[PDB]
Design a binder for these strands. Structure first.
Ligand SMILES: Nc1ncnc2c1ncn2[C@@H]1O[C@H](COP(=O)(O)O)[C@@H](O)[C@H]1O
Ligand SMILES: NC(=O)CC[C@H](N)C(=O)O
Length: 529
RNA sequence: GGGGUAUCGCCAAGCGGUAAGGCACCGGAUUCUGAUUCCGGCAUUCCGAGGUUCGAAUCCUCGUACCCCAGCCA
């Protein structure tokens, strides 16, 4: 439960509503990020719980900022998250004729007029946060004139910015949004849905409340910054001939530590090529989280966990990680991979190799087991061998033994280094029958794999607050490695993740994995303490 | 000016009855993954200062802090 569901309840109880109809109206001007997932879960979830309906609407009123790639991606992420919208996908543009009709109603009612103040003049007449605005000298034209003028605008008769339709409200309102808000502006730009049919487009404030009412929305859910706008939302509806009046309720938007959560800043990263694209695994986009190996369900749980309030918040990365870790911990089948390898030769070993049995999930036998190839020339992780080091160190030391994961116990005896004194191979003996603990990979049957270790995009907790958020990017947000995985992974499915034992959860694809060179993305590392 | 929000490090219940929960954190137990699991611990206090009440985080008052608004963006 949350404040919004309590309102909904009271409406249902009072009889003000007998059904609930919500909506997710992003503008198709960028890819969806996790903040939008909060909104999708909120709106689509309320619908299903209250046995109602929730539409997917593309708030497409600004042609110059939108693209068809985005509408396609949005529909894709919404689906991927696991939600279904009510009926067809809607578009604000579906109402362009209705909106133009309604603007004509406001004009006929004397509540709208065509202003000729330049875009600079409008701001100048607008007033300040503390000084009232002032009336345009064109504010009192007749209905007849406004009608003619608006038609002229609509017919491509005015150059851009040369005129616009403004609402006639109160230029001295403390609500700056109510100071004659612009209803229509001229843009000779082709729209991704209406092509070149219109040269005039409606503004957000005029469009949204009307789109909401036409679609029969009962509870319009948005974020805190449209609180002031709710006044214009109501004004518009209160002043036109429309049978319903949806009510807007605002909740705080999501802020995630170490990243930005606004399409504008995410676009800059894509545009400036500091990430591969909107779906880069380091990106907080739904596509990027998906490509990183995150499950729709872990995201759904994150949104459930964070809540919906009016408090400005900033969630910690540990919260999101917790969610994905919980999921993958339960479901990911375990595997063996070595991110940083060094060859270890069991001189004691005789043969061409053998096959040891390995559980697909050390705590869930029902998930079965598999046969993994063992031998005398395996691969271990460099950090798992210490010629020296403290008593706490539970891994391989130059005179100590260690249990090879699901195999035998071995003993390091003679190391071998190179020119720069770096070790090249470790010589050990194995106890013919012995079956800390360390993972390994038989060099002979090993599959060469590229491993991508992801990390926080930015060096600071709140990069969006920085003057130049880009200068504070983390140069180690992506560190690529070349390791070895058990041949098993030869059939790994893109997107699906496994737990690389003692390392973390990894998934294939990355838009890079080929048959020859597989690319594994580390979704999240295990809890190291 | 106006609109909003202030409860444990980060989220978050609580709507007059005397502070849920999650994340994180600190112990301990297990464990062929230093993971998982498993127990135990973690606000005598709710931005502040008064006030009303038998009694408030929950009501009033005066303050303080932070967020949002001056796109022909959404
Ligand atoms: N950062 C955010 N956090 C939560 N919801 C958001 C965020 N940004 C946008 N939305 C929601 O997604 C819709 C499209 O943007 C908005 O109408 C909001 O409901
Ligand atoms: N009122 C709202 O839900 C805002 C919709 C607007 N298109 C947005 O993406 O923020």
């Amino acid at each position: 439960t949350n404040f919004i569901r309590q309102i909904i309840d009271e409406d249902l109880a009072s009889g003000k509503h007998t059904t609930v109809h919500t909506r997710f109206p992003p503008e198709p001007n960028g890819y969806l990020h996790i903040g939008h997932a909060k909104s999708i879960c909120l709106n689509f979830g309320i619908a299903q719980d209250y046995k109602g309906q929730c539409n997917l609407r593309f708030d497409d009123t600004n042609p110059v900022k939108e693209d068809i790639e985005y509408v396609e991606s949005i529909k894709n992420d919404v689906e991927w998250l696991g939600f279904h919208w009510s009926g067809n996908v809607r578009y604000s543009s579906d109402y362009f004729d209705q909106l133009h009709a309604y603007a004509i109603e406001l004009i006929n009612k004397g509540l709208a007029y065509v202003d000729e103040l330049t875009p600079e003049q409008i701001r100048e007449y607008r007033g300040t946060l503390t000084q009232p605005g002032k009336n345009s000298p064109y504010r009192d034209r007749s209905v007849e004139e406004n009608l003619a003028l608006f038609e002229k605008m609509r017919a491509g008769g005015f150059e851009e910015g040369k005129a616009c339709l403004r609402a006639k409200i109160d230029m001295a309102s403390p609500f700056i949004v109510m100071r004659d808000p612009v209803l229509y502006r001229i843009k000779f730009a082709e729209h991704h849905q209406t092509g070149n049919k219109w040269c005039i487009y409606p503004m957000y404030d005029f469009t949204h409340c009307i789109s909401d009412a036409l679609e029969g929305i009962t509870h319009s859910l948005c974020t805190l910054e449209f609180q002031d706008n709710r006044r214009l939302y109501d004004w518009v509806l209160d002043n036109i001939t429309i049978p319903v009046h949806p009510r807007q309720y605002e909740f705080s938007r999501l802020n995630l530590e170490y990243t930005v959560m606004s399409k504008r800043k995410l676009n800059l990263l894509v545009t400036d090529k500091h990430v591969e694209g909107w779906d880069d695994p380091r990106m907080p986009t739904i596509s990027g989280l998906r490509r990183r190996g995150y499950t729709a369900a872990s995201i759904r749980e994150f949104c459930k966990r964070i809540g919906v309030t009016k408090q400005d918040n900033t969630i910690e990365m540990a919260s999101l990680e917790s969610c994905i870790r919980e999921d993958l911990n339960e479901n990911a089948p375990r595997a063996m991979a070595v991110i940083d390898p060094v060859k270890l030769v069991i001189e004691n070993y005789q043969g061409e190799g053998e096959m040891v049995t390995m559980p697909n999930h050390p705590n869930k036998p029902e998930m079965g087991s598999r046969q993994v190839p063992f031998s005398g020339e395996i691969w271990i992780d460099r950090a798992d061998f210490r010629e020296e080091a403290n008593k706490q160190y539970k891994r391989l030391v130059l005179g100590k033994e260690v249990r090879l994961r699901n195999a035998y116990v071995i003993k390091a005896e003679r190391v071998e280094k190179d020119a720069e004194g770096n070790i090249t191979t470790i010589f050990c003996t194995y106890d013919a029958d012995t079956l800390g603990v360390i993972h390994w990979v038989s060099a002979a049957h090993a599959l060469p794999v590229e491993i991508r270790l992801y990390d926080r995009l930015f060096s600071v907790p709140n990069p969006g607050a920085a003057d130049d958020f880009l200068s504070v990017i983390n140069p180690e947000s992506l560190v690529i490695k070349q390791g070895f995985a058990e041949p098993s992974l030869k059939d790994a499915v893109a997107g699906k993740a496994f737990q690389f034992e003692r390392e973390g959860y990894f998934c294939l694809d990355s838009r890079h994995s080929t048959a020859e060179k597989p690319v594994f993305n580390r979704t999240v590392g295990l809890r190291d303490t």
